[PDB]
Amino acid sequence: ASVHGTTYELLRRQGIDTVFGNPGSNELPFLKDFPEDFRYILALQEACVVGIADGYAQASRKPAFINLHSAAGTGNAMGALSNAWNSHSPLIVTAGQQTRAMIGVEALLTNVDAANLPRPLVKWSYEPASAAEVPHAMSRAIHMASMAPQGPVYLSVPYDDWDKDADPQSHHLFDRHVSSSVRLNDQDLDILVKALNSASNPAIVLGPDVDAANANADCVMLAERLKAPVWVAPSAPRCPFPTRHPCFRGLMPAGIAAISQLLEGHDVVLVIGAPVFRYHQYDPGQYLKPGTRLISVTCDPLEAARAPMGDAIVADIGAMASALANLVEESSRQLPTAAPEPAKVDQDAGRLHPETVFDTLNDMAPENAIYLNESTSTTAQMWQRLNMRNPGSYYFCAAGGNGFALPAAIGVQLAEPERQVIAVIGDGSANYSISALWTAAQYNIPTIFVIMNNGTYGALRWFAGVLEAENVPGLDVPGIDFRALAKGYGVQALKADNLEQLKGSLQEALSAKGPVLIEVSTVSP
């Protein structure tokens, strides 16, 4: 067998059947004779390729396979890898290298010092020392991406390797099963459970790895047993809990003092599947108030090490959530009371308030819709106004890097063909990965893109106000016609200048058979 044949066999035996890519010359020997059981998803720029793959991996809860071109293609994807690192996304990033005989001379298209290029945003990064090693290196990449804590990995392959003979012993790779589905030992788990059972006023904080593990339902059982309020950890990349459940208390503010004040009076705070914590604004004060102690369950040693307070347990979130939910006592305390609905903001017949947009989406969207957020000044309102009952219903750029949601929404829609994806993206953010629209058109992936057009980088105006910074350039983005961009890439487009038009546009989009972009004129901040 060739390295080509052996590697595609390994991939299919490990459950991989899709290549997200933008091709180049070093990759043609890999892509040729493309197997009939695989499918290739082209995107026009590598941030788009990786964003699509990332949404697909996060929603499908399985690794996604990517093929990029050498250093320039890898480099174009590096901002997307920033986000994937902070979402623990299992991404297998492969890139083609020059033929081994010209790597030394640094021929055009040589990826120099290739393994160092995507560092520090990958868990593992490698270029094999010979062609026959390629399948074994691919096996390493698959497992490194997939083991807890999941994350992106990188493999560079000289183009001449694919046609070489494989090692006959590579067959031992095909059916390897690697598990990290582990939980705390019984003795120590009993100590934790007793601490939770004994707490007088526990609180629960959940992060993205809960949703990645599909631990959401177990966390609902845990919160119901403990009679405990539940928040989402700050800067949330995913939604780990039903947002209208009576225990839900919303998105935590991303500040040190704000969080310790919120937790004041809670004796035990159990954090599951989050860093402790993804603060943003500097809001100095106490990490925790006297009387509060914190216990974190995390799948990532790096998160456990860097928490500034609390105890930690490094284990699989699915296994731990299941065990805790099933072991804790039912407390005799009263179940928390559901938060009241948000108020309707006043809305005239002109430009839309973001609150109106989210209320209207909540009214019109299916109950199993999936939302993505890159409308960066409106996140708090989004979290208050969308009832997200089901797992896998929300994604936000985990590193804060714009350019995620537009492509990721396409990947999510590919992963979840029966759940309508609705990406709510600001006019600023829409540009970073605009060409991803083309992939939705070409493959008829029926994502709805809602562009919140207020003419400015609103979240930067917000932060400038926090800093009391004046005379800052570069904050306005006038003069973009998003319907023309959508037409450019073959996507049906609508505009909503007022509420009547927003309702009409959403009704048309929801009954369309392909992707649709709606440009919404929103109020300037």
Next chain:
Amino acid sequence: ASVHGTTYELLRRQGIDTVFGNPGSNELPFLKDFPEDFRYILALQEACVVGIADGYAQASRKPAFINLHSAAGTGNAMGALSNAWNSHSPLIVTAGQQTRAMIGVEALLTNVDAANLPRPLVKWSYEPASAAEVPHAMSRAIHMASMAPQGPVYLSVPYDDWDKDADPQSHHLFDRHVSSSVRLNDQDLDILVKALNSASNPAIVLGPDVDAANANADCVMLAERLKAPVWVAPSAPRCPFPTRHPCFRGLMPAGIAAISQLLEGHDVVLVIGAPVFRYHQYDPGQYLKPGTRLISVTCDPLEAARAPMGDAIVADIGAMASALANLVEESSRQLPTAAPEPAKVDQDAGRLHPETVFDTLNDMAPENAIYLNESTSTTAQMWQRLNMRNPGSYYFCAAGGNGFALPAAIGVQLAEPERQVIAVIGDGSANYSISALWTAAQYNIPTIFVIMNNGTYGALRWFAGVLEAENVPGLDVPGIDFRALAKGYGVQALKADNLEQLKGSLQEALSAKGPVLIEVSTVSP
């Protein structure tokens, strides 16, 4: 003085007056109170920011200053840095970091292990250990980018540093002058000159660092004195010689055997300002034939070390070209005969052959036009058909990374307001950095963009044919309306489906007062 005030003073004292950027939260404390004598050029995605800055630096022959956001913004620019590394572009890349007090916790927007992120594509990469060090670190960045061999550098700055007090001793930085304008010692230079004077059939090969040094005219004098044919080294990022001068012989083929065959019979081959050599296709054979010896003058130790043959001298290209041109004897040999004009290809009333497009551009464009090339299957024809008399007249992605020419053409046009820039970009390549169009519209930078639309990644079909690779996915890019994309970003747009319309479109574009995009229907390969 604050670090902010001191750093802008250093920048202006070192000749920097423009910030190319896409802002974020960590950068607002740098950008605030933006000085009145500076200008800020916004682009909508970081590949665009860096491409614009790169074109500006290459055309202006001076460093360009960039400001990006943390890891995600830096990462989005990494493919652009691939190209800048191989063009020796003097780019000062700055990125904002989180406040020092939350770097440890890895708050949102922390750039983890920041200096390793852009490696291996930068000459120098650093995050200062204290606020007061920032001006001194900026000084290092300026000089590292600017000294031979020029190239990109990276500086990460915690956002809280800018308001801190500067070191009063930072004033010693402001007027430092650093020179690398050096040439081989007299004794050894005399030996080289005697070898050139003695040669029976010398040849000259020129690379991009000739054009970067503005050594072009000196190289013309040298070639005229030596009566020697002149080629351009393969995979050429710039044009180092007048393309209708009698000595000019065109772009070398990017293959080992092809080059040694071309040089056969030349006893001494003098390479100036090029790697030896940027081959692409694998074309194995002799590096040089018996009877040919090679001497390379390069500004880059890495190029001198990796050449597989020849002697080398590491020195400034401007200083060496001037010295050689003025020291060599005038040979009594006959001056080489100019190459004949290319033939007109047959052209019917339908889709355009690329050769027709280039002939028409050559007929209609001003004599001091500047061209950029990202029409990757048509490079050889472009080189044959455009008379480029002047320095600074051609740019092509030096690492082969698509996404350079569209933004770079804007930067070049900014650098050269009196020379009409015409970027010839394939339909595939146009997408990588499409949002750069917006910057041309907003700042009214009157670049002309000629989109060669053949529906496919033609150069990849070419390489697949070289490999005899079949059943490759992802090679076609149907369904893009470039006039709608241009309208999306505010750029006037025209379409040319035939030669009559191409002439009309070019006449309109050349008399327009702002940027113009022309979508040209070209023949499918």
Next chain:
Amino acid sequence: ASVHGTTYELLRRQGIDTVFGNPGSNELPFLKDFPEDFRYILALQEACVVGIADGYAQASRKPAFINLHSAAGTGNAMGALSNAWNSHSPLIVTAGQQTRAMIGVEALLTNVDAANLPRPLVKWSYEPASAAEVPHAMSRAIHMASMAPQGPVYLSVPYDDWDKDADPQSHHLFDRHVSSSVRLNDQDLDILVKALNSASNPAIVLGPDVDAANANADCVMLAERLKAPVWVAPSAPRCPFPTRHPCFRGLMPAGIAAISQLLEGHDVVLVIGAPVFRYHQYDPGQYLKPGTRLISVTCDPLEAARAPMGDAIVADIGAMASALANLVEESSRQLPTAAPEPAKVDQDAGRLHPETVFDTLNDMAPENAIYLNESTSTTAQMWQRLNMRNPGSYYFCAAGGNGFALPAAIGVQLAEPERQVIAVIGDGSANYSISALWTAAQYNIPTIFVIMNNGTYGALRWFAGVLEAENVPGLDVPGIDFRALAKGYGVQALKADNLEQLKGSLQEALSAKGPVLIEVSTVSP
């Protein structure tokens, strides 16, 4: 509180009370006002410092704290870190940096790009962005070294940081408890247990992480229940099993084909706490024979990913060994039969055969002796001839790097004051870290050093024979007087030229009150 006071409080609250070091100027602000409850162990060269700390950490099963000087001191320790990486040794390596105000100028003693220096041999490597972050960075280092898979970490601290004010919120660091004591979920653990219970001819292979976890006794119970033979994985850094237990089968040969042949006929091979596998010689063939399947339990994702065959589970070795030992059925198969004693080799009245030395050690040493091995040509005989009943009884350089055993034996003896340590070290290996002898003398740490003096690098002669390599220089090390070296560093020294003198020398050494070196004249290979 100062950073100094806060950091020593963190250290003592996390169980650290000893600093292994070689001081320098950048470290004096850390070491000053040294707390009375700590002790400082000086060694004369940094390979020695780290080797001592490594033996201490491995034997004490807890992290060891090291302080080295800047880049040169860190660099001198890098070979020792090679070994520590492959033994999963929890080492907290700190090094002093220049004052922040001169880092930029690169004053003498600046550690440039410090965090990259010990890479790739550390799990985590960092220099804090401010003085107030130092305690939090130290907390990260402690936990990163200590969490599974344990390993070395690196922290660089500018010397001016220690006297700065600490953050009052650093107290939350002091009592953090971080656990990685995890095991496979119940459902999947039951599947594994059923597979073991069902096996017709199981085999067990154990590696060093068993001994690190003190899982040895659980592995004895497991082997007795399963009625299974037990080997030690190749290139063994530790001894995980009693070597005279009836199930024990010895050290595996370090070759692919040799291992698959050894395992032939075993239907299920359970590997615990080892890489799969640390082969040495290239012995190509089948990784496993038909009929054998492999299951690995490893604490290290990197080991699970790179195994070329088998299933894997990533979990804590102590927790998994305990669970398996207690859950499996007692098989009705007959218990394996103990291996017979090794034969006595013929020995005349002259130079000693290594087999004689090991037999004599086994006869004379206490039953709870601890051995170290850096007599590299005699490892197989050592493993056959020493009855090691107890955990923590054997150490060998895990990366194969000479210079470990001499210092490590001192650290082990410090960790285990009531168990006599006997380091068996070749004449070649003894030189790498010879100055470590001084630390044994100064602190009266009563290690016995047995120098096997055959005049040559015997293991290299062995490998040269495997390669059929001739005319190799540098293999002989004549002319070293080890008694004079021992006298140089204050250690009592004896010589044994024959068996009578070996017995007499060992009797004297075993009844000495301090360290003793015995130079043994062994047969030349």
